[PDB]
Design a binder for these strands. Sequence first.
RNA 1: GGUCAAUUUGAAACAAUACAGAGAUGAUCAGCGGUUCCCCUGGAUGAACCGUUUUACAAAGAGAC
Length: 363
Amino acid sequence: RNRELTTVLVKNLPKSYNQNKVYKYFKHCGPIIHVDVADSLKKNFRFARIEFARYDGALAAITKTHKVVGQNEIIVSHLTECTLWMTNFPPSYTQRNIRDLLQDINVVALSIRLPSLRFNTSRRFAYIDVTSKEDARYCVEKLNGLKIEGYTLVTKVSNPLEKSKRTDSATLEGREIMIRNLSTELLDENLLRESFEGFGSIEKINIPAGQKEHSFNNCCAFMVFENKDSAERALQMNRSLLGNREISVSLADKKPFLERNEVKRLLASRNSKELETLICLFPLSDKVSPSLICQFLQEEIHINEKDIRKILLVSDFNGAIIIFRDSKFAAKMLMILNGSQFQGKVIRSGTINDMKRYYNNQQ
RNA sequence: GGUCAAUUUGAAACAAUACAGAGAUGAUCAGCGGUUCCCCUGGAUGAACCGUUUUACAAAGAGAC
């Protein structure tokens, strides 16, 4: 997709102009996907961002430049060089928090867009459209490197082609193997290097701590190769003997896969001791993180942080699982939370099956 | 009992939390088959549910034939 290509910026709309009036003014130009309106800094006029379905619609809108709306002469232009990409804001930061950051440095924000957590609960970044290239460069100047709650903010002029390499990229790229069922005697970086370096250059070896120290029967290690072909061929070591131990070798799985399989175990659980310690909250937006939910439980419901064991998203049923420390606390939370308000919307509480039944009814 | 097998355990998931939009994903939430409900006059939908393809090793094993 290319949002920018079909998006235009409108400057100097009348104070009285709302999203609806913007639609009516421009809807003859072509079908519109989205409209945002924002006040100017001093509230004397309004800006609009209009995302058209197709490029021809954006072209048609631009023919309205220097036309008069009310008694305001508007300017319509391609939205370009006005988009920031931001990451590593705190886990509980909201769209409003980001908007307020820019407000503080006197930058008008037209649109702030956050990603779905559906397939990865940890996703955390945002796109922000401002009204000028100057404001965009100013946001980078003031906000890139800003420390917020211990997090060093990243703020960039948006260009996905320039994206940084993630620190976990080796796993994403299929270059990391996991070796399982090593004995403590074999849990030795030198031995692992000697046994695997024939396949290709080894970039890194990671051995989880505490394994020898706790005398584990089976130990694991991870090995990153400089290229994917070496890691693939190293899989031939699966089921091979190292000393007198048959080892397993596989491509390391990634976190979102592992995390989802954990949730699946819960959804399939029939252990009543376990089930009675949890509740589900639904329906919830798929943009809502466990951290945001935790903050809500602590600040609005006055639950203590340590009464909460874990929060897991179940976005396939528009919900989240909250695991508490006992069934009695869970039961009281069931009562308190049902019908409470979260993000301006009423939410329900219930069992896993209640959550599923509610979802099925909406479909 | 003899094969089949919810799950539990051996057992440690490292690597920096983030790190490029539903523009994301691996059955991670997939494909196919099959009964049900919805709406027509055997059919057309959508959804749910049930099986088959898929799955590192090892020990144990609710419950099934």
